[PDB]
Structures are given as C-alpha cells and as structure tokens.
Amino acid sequence: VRPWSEFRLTPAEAAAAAALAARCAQRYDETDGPEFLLDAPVIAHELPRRLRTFMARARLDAWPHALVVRGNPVDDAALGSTPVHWRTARTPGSRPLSFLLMLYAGLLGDVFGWATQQDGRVVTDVLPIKGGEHTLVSSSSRQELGWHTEDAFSPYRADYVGLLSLRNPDGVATTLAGVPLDDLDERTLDVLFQERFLIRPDDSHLQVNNSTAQQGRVEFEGIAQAADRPEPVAILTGHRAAPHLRVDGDFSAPAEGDEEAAAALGTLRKLIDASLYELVLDQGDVAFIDNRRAVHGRRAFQPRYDGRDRWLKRINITRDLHRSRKAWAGDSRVLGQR
Ligand SMILES: N=C(N)NCCCC[C@H](N)C(=O)O
Ligand SMILES: O=C(O)CCC(=O)C(=O)O
Ligand SMILES: [Fe+2]
C-alpha cells in the first residue's frame, strides 16, 4: 500500500502541462502578480483532463496524507545552477516550473504567502544555505528538519503545502506522519483534543530570515505576540475517528504546569517518531501535503554547495482565503497580523 495518493503523467500529458506553464510565463510578468494569482485557477482548467480528474477526486478521499504527481520533465542545463540563497532564486530557468506549481495548486485551492516569510512571496524556495546547516528552517541540511504542521502557530495555516522538486540528485527524503490513531489510547486522545498546549511561530517568521526593507514590517509584531504570549490550543480537532492535527516537534509545549497535557504530548512525540516514513521527491515530482492530516519534515543531508544542490519550489494553499481575512494586508495574498 501507499499512505499518499499518486498520479504519474504520461510524457504527452507532462509535455502539455509544461507547454501551458511556458505560455503563462510568456504572458504574465510574475507568478505572484495580482493578475496571475486571479487567472491561474481558471487557466488550470486547460491542464490534461486525467490530471484534473485525479486532483478533483483525490482531494475528496478520506485517507491520503498527500497528493503526489510524478513525471514533469526538468532540463538541468536549462534550469541552471541552484541559487545560493532564496533572495536570488527566481532564476529564468526555474520560472516556467514556478508557473507550473501555481497552476497545479489552483486546482486544489487559494494560494497565499506570509509577509514575514521570504519577503511575502507566494512561490517560495527550499534550498540549502551555506552557514545555515543546523537551523530550524527549510534551508537547513546537516540537521534534520523535524516533523511539523506548517505554520502550526497560526489559525490561518495552509490546508495543503505544495512542493515541486526542481532537483534532488541524491534522493533526499521528505518525511511524513499521520495521526497515530492505531496507538493513541482514549485518555491520551481526550487530552490532545483539549486546549492545553502552546504552539509558537517557527524561525522562518523572524526578521533575521527576511530581506532588509521597509515593507511587511508591521506583520512581525503579530509573530512576536504569538511567541511571547501563546494562547492555549488543542493539538487534535474534529472527528475522533479521523482527527486533524496541529503540532510542531520543536515548537510545541504543554500549557505551563499542565503535566497531563505534557504526558499526552510526550506520548504523541514518541508515536509520531516511530511511524514517520519517507517520500522521495525526485526531479519533477510534485507533492501536495495535507497539512491537517499529516506532519512533514526533511531528512538530514550533506549539502554540496557546487551548484547542483537539492532545490524545491514551495507554496501555501487554503481551501478558503476568507478564513484569514483578519490577516489580509489589503487586496494582496500576503498574510500577517498586528
Ligand atoms: N520543526 C521545525 N523546524 N519547524 C519549522 C519548519 C520551518 C518551515 C518553514 N516554512 C521554513 O520554510 O523554514
Ligand atoms: O525539504 C522538504 O522536503 C520539505 C521542507 C519543508 O518542510 C518546508 O519547506 O516547509
Ligand atoms: Fe514544512
């Protein structure tokens, strides 16, 4: 069996999708522009029909931890070298594939970014940054990126996290885990459903990991407030027979003094560690991880820094943009609170 739902494009289907993405790259200035953000979900209706059928059906299945699409061609010569930093990572060689990710994402929901992550970009980059090997962010390498719900701190966190592998020559694995429902006893389960846990914002929302500028400044105040004064929240929500999950291995904690909550979180850590499995996104593979059913991470790897490091494009997707209207800056798709 497979804990995720998988689709493999035929070469003709893959070529057609690539051609559509190239057409979009020709007609629009950028992926994050207001025009393409609005048009992408409608343009996505032109994608191969079998793919559209897969995305419409697979999103509605009860079981998958992710939707995986294999077989998008990528030419390393045309792509160019892996950028040394996310700031300069919008290279012409990666441009069509960024449009492709956006088109696929449009079939699943509304895309958005954060004013406090990678300068408010909607399509972001995952690549190893020299000197940042042992950090808690996605540009780490030598230190494993521990399992987490994406943006667990925030009620406006994505429903799906999309990852498109531009290159991954050494087959470094993305990690995944669902709710360990086969092992959680009912008392522990009960406690995890109660608002007895603290979840702070991760290091990607700190000013040090964004560019020096006077734009998207006030949104860092809300991040500080979530870090300093986290309100108690639940880890599990919804149906007891199929709970949704909100946890971060490195940023979760029990409510102060709450030893029963602590025991439940401790047990959850153990059970998630034991059931964590691997998904290798080879060059051209795309994954849309269900951020409510599963946590994810990335295995430790030795970075190359020779121009051919592992490199992903990434995007946040919500089923309903209006859920986060508090955090709207204006008419943009960039979230953050004061
Ligand atoms: N357990 C950890 N490390 N949690 C934080 C994960 C960081 C993900 C973030 N969007 C990034 O791009 O770094
Ligand atoms: O590198 C990966 O496969 C996933 C990285 C990740 O968890 C993220 O960017 O949020
Ligand atoms: Fe993540």
Swiss-Prot record:
Example of a GO biological process term: antibiotic biosynthetic process
UniProt catalytic activity: L-arginine + 2-oxoglutarate + O2 = (2S,3S)-hydroxyarginine + succinate + CO2
Keywords of the record: Antibiotic biosynthesis, Iron, Membrane, Metal-binding, Oxidoreductase, Transmembrane, Transmembrane helix
Binding site for L-arginine: L136, V137, S138, D248, G249, D250, R314
Enzyme class, spelled out: oxidoreductase
Domain of life: Bacteria
EC number(s) reported in the record: 1.14.11.41
A single GO molecular function term of this UniProt record: iron ion binding
Protein name listed in UniProt: Alpha-ketoglutarate-dependent L-arginine hydroxylase
Residue stretches spanning the membrane: 97-115
Annotated 2-oxoglutarate binding sites: T174, R310, R314
Principal place of residence: membrane
Membrane topology listed for this record: Single-pass membrane protein
Family to which this protein belongs: Belongs to the clavaminate synthase family.
GO cellular component: membrane
The keyword Transmembrane helix is annotated on this UniProt entry: yes
Role this protein plays: Involved in the biosynthesis of capreomycidine, an unusual amino acid used by non-ribosomal peptide synthases (NRPS) to make the tuberactinomycin class of peptide antibiotics such as viomycin and capreomycin. Catalyzes the stereospecific hydroxylation of the C3 of (2S)-arginine to generate (3S)-hydroxy-(2S)-arginine. Usually clavaminic acid synthase-like oxygenases catalyze the formation of threo diastereomers, however VioC produces the erythro diastereomer of beta-carbon-hydroxylated L-arginine.
This protein's pathway: Antibiotic biosynthesis
Localization annotation: Membrane
Obligatory cofactor(s): Fe cation
Record InterPro entries: Alpha-KG_dependent_hydroxylase, Arginine_beta-hydroxylase, Clavaminate_syn-like, TauD-like_sf, TauD/TfdA-like
Binding site for Fe cation: H148, E150, H296
